[PDB]
Amino acid sequence: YPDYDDFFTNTVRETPLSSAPEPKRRFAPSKHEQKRILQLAYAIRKGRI
């Protein structure tokens, strides 16, 4: 039962793990909500909602 040996986590990693670039999903209004807003818009004008 030795003590915890933090041979790897004893130093802080300065950079994010992944290098993939940010998609534009995260800087523009969401498309899922816009898709549902158009669907709800169709429902309103047809009298369903």
Partner: protein, 139 residues
Amino acid sequence: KGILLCTNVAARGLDIPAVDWIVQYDPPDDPRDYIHRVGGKSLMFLAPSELGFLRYLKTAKVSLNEFEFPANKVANVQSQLEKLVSKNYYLQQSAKDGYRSYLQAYASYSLKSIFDINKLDLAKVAKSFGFAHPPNVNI
């Protein structure tokens, strides 16, 4: 009156007009070219970890003076600068590409003993680019 930003290579081969200030924001990739290219005011940004260039200029017989600045008067817009980069998609992609290119240029400097990427602190460099933490660039 005006201000222009250009690379060393783009300025190389062009005639320099009557300019009040010439600023070397990034180290010169061709110091042997820069020592004779310098011949109103000449100013150069240097990190405290690149003081070996001072010795090189002394060995190359280059006269120079010390420019000092008050840390109080430096604009503390680091918080606002961080806000703009993370908020604008195109500003961020420009910031990441510039950070990657600056590092890769730094790794390729001829004066390895003076401009050493290992002696460079990446957390500080990303801060100048508007990053809380260094982006993930493979060298």
